[PDB]
Amino acid sequence: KVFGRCELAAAMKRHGLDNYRGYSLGNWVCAAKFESNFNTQATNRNTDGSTDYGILQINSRWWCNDGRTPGSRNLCNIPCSALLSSDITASVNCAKKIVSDGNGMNAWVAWRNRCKGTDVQAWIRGCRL
Ligand SMILES: [Cl-]
Ligand SMILES: [Co+2]
């Protein structure tokens, strides 16, 4: 599913991401925009052989099992394919673990490089939450 901006903001709010670990909703919407272009089906291979999955581009080396990443730790205890669903629940639940891991949203390179320090409130402007 390709989400609209406000549609995704509303879904993320319903799933408890607004101000989760102190990160306002706009941060999450911005991260999703630049990680996946709001497409739940996005996948991208990495040089290390791992793959990133779904709207928040969660990695198979640490977080989910894709059956082809040797030594994967599967810390979210889910198949990576679950992260490609139109229902964002599994992605959100896993993202909450990632952001709690010590480095906050710096875990997402696109967030660090494209969202951090910017006016992230713009990403939810106009939306009826
Ligand atoms: Cl933090
Ligand atoms: Co990535």
- CATH number of the domain that 24 lies in? 1.10.530.10
**Residue 18 Cα, ligand 1 centroid: separation in angstroms?**
14
- Which ligand sits closest to the CA of 116? 1
Query: Where in the sequence is the domain holding 57, given as residue range(s)?
Result: 1-129
Interatomic CA distance for residues 20 and 89, integer angstroms: 15
Sheet strands (E) in 1-129:
43-45, 51-53, 58-59
**Residue 126 Cα, ligand 1 centroid: separation in angstroms?**
27
The annotation status of 87 as a binding-site residue, yes or no, is no
On whether the CB atoms of residues 38 and 8 are closer than 8 A, the answer is: yes
Question: Is 35 an active-site residue?
Answer: yes
Write out the residues surrounding ion ligand 1, Cβ under 5 A.
104
Resolution in A: 1.5
As a 3-state breakdown, the chain gives helix, strand, coil percent values, each rounded to 5, of 40, 10, 50
HSE (CB half, 13 Å, CA atoms) of 92?
Answer: 19
The number of domains in the chain is 1
On whether the CB atoms of residues 43 and 84 are closer than 8 A, the answer is: yes
Catalytic residue among 35, 66, 87, 119: 35
